[PDB]
Design a protein around this ligand. Structure first.
Ligand SMILES: *C/C=C1/C(=C/C2=NC(=C\c3[nH]c(/C=C4\NC(=O)C(C=C)=C4C)c(C)c3CCC(=O)O)/C(CCC(=O)O)=C2C)NC(=O)C1C
Ligand SMILES: *C/C=C1/C(=C/C2=NC(=C\c3[nH]c(/C=C4\NC(=O)C(C=C)=C4C)c(C)c3CCC(=O)O)/C(CCC(=O)O)=C2C)NC(=O)C1C
Lengths: 488, 488
């Protein structure tokens, strides 16, 4: 695996686990040990090979009975402070996937998992905005789980990631407002992150423990998709080492059954969280996901309500004026309140009126012509104007994205909304002087090169028009075409 | 074509047109007459065959120049009061589809199309609810276009149609609140109705004029998809004759780029609308579609806002009470305000509390068990309970549909919403004594048998849970699981 084939890496079947625990794979109904981690002996105090030997021979009739009764769904069953025949005490993660029972053993903590979680969930459930929930969560998770850095990664439309909040040790460099490309988290990883709520890396520079056998008789590997001990891609491992990150923990933020983003915790020293703390963090993750979902819904409603109110106000004015074109010339800048834009313009009766960051005066008739061509009396929008009009590249720094609203059924009059190149709007709060030590596969696996690659990928492009933007533009079209008809 | 193969009828290529006009098909660039209607001669005053003869030879160099310049999109170009070489005056519908130019001739009216339309659109654009827009539109269209009956057909989720408003002559029978099955308008018709804004039938018992040739050299038929003179299925023709309907006009209501339903006008006598009146009706259709869309959006917002307000109120109460289970037992009936239901129930700590039309007390533990099984801590909903629990058939008249909201992360407590069998809720304002004269293919093509077939198809089923219903239920889940956590 290298930078050429890391996008198709089968990370779900690595045939290795992390040192902080040991793994035993069994048949569908926990009779026979088919696979075991090389370190199974070292931790459980067993000698020789465990494969072929029966479940009750290796663990003990006592424990095997508890595990069978528990497996009653692909969601792993957590079972703390379980006792082996020996007398050693382990925290046990038990799950079943592809008709194979997987049992993960951890040296066992003793704290209240629901107790920690309730404290944390109480402090976020009164948040009245996405921004308030996001900003407090990094701060809160850092204080509670004592990680050196906590980021929230939010996925863009194109799969790119933005760092939307950060709590960190003062000495560490900030990634706040920094973007990373979609390739930095390939599709197969995003699929696993949708299936596993949270994901641990105890030691990025630790020695991986192989699973025996890696491939069985039938030629199948062991699918560690739902196994918390699953080993990390050496590509990501090298990325964390280059950043000075030794340990990580990530929580999946699931909103409307989609991967919205990750809460990602970085530590500069090796770090294992005990099962009870992981349970608490996972439950915090669920409640964070649920509350962000409701807040996302409330904001959409408020945005659309505000647009409806603005349009009602405008329709009430339109009735009292005789000349609608006069009212539009005076009013058009006020429509910038409806949809986030860096500039708005009115093209009415082959005349141009601008406000904010619009293309130059001479460029407008070409655009207007183009809009009349493809619009077909519907809202038209692009985040990449130069891809539609190559000569539009020249003014991308001012207007890289456009949304056109037809304001007349009869004539080709348009209300145009403009967005600057997304690179212009960067409020990046990082250090450009900060250099990173690289490994075998070069400086590609550094936040500096990642950010540079993203910047290249969004050249001459604006912030994409959201679904909310297009809903409001459609409601505005119907309102403006509606009164344009009344005034004819 | 008969009741066995009428669902796959190729209505777009019938090889016939209606008598109230004549049709000439030409090559992609209007050089050569490839096809013509048999009645082309009778109306235009030409002798013999027109096929093979050039465009300029049959129409005249004067007219052919105007038609070419006009065809500058698959949307037909309307051109009233055009003059032939002869001196006769025609209204001309010109369109191009599958690289074939189709020209439709009508004996030409003289009224203002934009004038009529503006009067009508003014009277609907101040409607503040869907119900107000719907009720006034049938009344308005009847008064303006003088049709004997005007219905609005609204398509259900399953493709079935409901008659949601009606203006009619007092002597005629009412179809208000009556449903018809999805098969009464097959998929290929719904596809055409999405492509053609409005659709005329001048005379259901008129003689269809054939197109010559029906099939050309290459073996292709003439696609009359966008032709207003296209002839109707003999199946539908027989349906209208059995109802005593001689003429029809239908307008497509397009909402969020989907076929929402039809404005359908029935006349007991033959009836042609002139091109200028059709243009007006088509523009009224567009504005009706646009205003219903905005009103649909406003109602969804209001519904979701109201739910958010109710939940805030409930969360404010939950803070002041100590015992949440006590509050739920006292309050649960109030959640019936959030989602339209005929009954609501609380299943908390293996205890049942009912309100309205719920299943019997003894049936609840079975349901509760089933819900805990399939729910997996997400909102679960069916409109057909007996399909999931066969023994639930017994109480379908009281509860045929259920939506279950999990109110706890930890225990299997549920808030259950119930809907009666959809047949129970019928506010049908029609005449069951009214019998219909049938034709060759029997009593299937009567509103009485259509309604009977629909009733059979929705037996043991409730009104489906809308997207709005499920959004609110999800927000309620997050609110109730949220405070259940705080109180543990
Ligand atoms: C060519 C393939 C590459 C690649 C693969 C890869 N990434 C994985 C996980 C992953 N990658 C990131 C990226 C970042 N984290 C940061 O903090 C920053 C910058 C500050 C970046 C750019 C992250 C956050 C993650 C975690 C994903 C998660 O835990 O859900 C993985 C899977 C790792 C695993 O096995 O758990 C793979 C494979 N990364 C590359 O950069 C490239 C080019
Ligand atoms: C087996 C096929 C059948 C069928 C085919 C068919 N229906 C078509 C159009 C159409 N059908 C209805 C149905 C009704 N109109 C009413 O007023 C009532 C009851 C009061 C009913 C049940 C309607 C309204 C329409 C008009 C559709 C439109 O104009 O968009 C067509 C196409 C007609 C055409 O060529 O324009 C076909 C084919 N109808 C059957 O009942 C059955 C079984």
């Amino acid at each position: 695996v290298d930078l050429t084939n890391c996008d198709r890496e089968p990370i779900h079947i690595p045939g290795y686990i992390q040192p902080h625990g040991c793994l035993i794979a069994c048949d569908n109904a926990m009779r026979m040990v088919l696979r075991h981690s090389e370190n199974c002996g070292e931790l459980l105090g067993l000698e020789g090979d465990l494969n072929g030997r029966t479940a009750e021979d290796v663990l003990g009739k006592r424990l095997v009975h508890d595990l069978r009764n528990a497996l009653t769904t692909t969601r792993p069953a957590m079972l703390p402070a379980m006792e082996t025949s020996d007398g050693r005490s382990f925290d046990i993660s038990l799950h079943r996937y592809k008709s194979t029972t997987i049992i993960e053993f951890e040296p066992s903590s003793d704290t209240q998992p629901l107790g920690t979680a309730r404290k944390m969930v109480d402090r976020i459930r009164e948040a009245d905005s996405v921004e308030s929930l996001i900003s407090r969560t990094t701060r809160l998770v850092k204080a509670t789980l004592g990680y050196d850095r906590v980021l929230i990664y939010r996925f863009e439309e194109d799969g790119a990631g933005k760092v939307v909040s950060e709590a960190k040790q003062p000495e560490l460099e900030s990634f706040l407002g920094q973007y990373f490309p979609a390739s930095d988290i390939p599709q197969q990883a995003r699929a696993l992150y949708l299936k596993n709520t949270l994901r641990i890396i105890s030691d990025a520079s630790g020695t991986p423990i192989p699973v025996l056998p890696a491939v069985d008789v039938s030629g199948e590997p062991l699918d560690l998709s739902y196994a918390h001990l699953r080993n990390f891609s050496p590509i990501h491992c090298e990325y964390l080492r280059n950043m000075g990150v030794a340990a990580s923990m990530s929580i999946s933020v699931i909103v409307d059954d989609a991967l919205w983003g990750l809460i990602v915790c970085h530590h500069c020293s090796p770090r294992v969280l005990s099962m009870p703390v992981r349970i608490a963090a996972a439950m915090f993750g669920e409640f964070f996901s649920m509350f962000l979902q409701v807040l996302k819904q409330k904001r959409r409603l408020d945005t659309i309500n505000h647009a409806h109110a603005a349009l009602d106000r405008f329709l009430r004015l339109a009735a009292h004026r005789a000349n609608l074109e006069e009212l539009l010339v005076d009013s058009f800048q006020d429509f910038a309140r409806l949809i986030p834009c860096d500039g708005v313009g009115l093209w009415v009766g082959n005349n141009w009126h601008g406000h904010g960051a619009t293309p130059p005066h001479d460029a407008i008739p070409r655009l207007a012509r183009f809009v009349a061509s493809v619009s077909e009396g519907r809202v038209w929008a692009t985040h990449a104007l130069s891809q539609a009009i190559p000569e539009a590249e020249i003014y991308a720094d001012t207007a890289a994205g456009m949304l056109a609203i037809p304001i007349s059924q009869v004539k080709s009059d348009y209300l145009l909304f403009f967005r600057k190149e997304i690179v212009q709007n960067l409020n990046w709060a990082g250090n450009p002087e900060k250099s990173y030590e690289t490994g075998p596969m070069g400086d590609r696996l550094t936040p500096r090169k990642s950010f540079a690659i993203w910047k290249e990928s969004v050249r001459l492009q604006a912030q994409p028009w959201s679904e909310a933007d297009r809903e409001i533009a459609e409601t505005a079209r119907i309102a403006l075409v509606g009164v344009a008809f009344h005034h004819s």
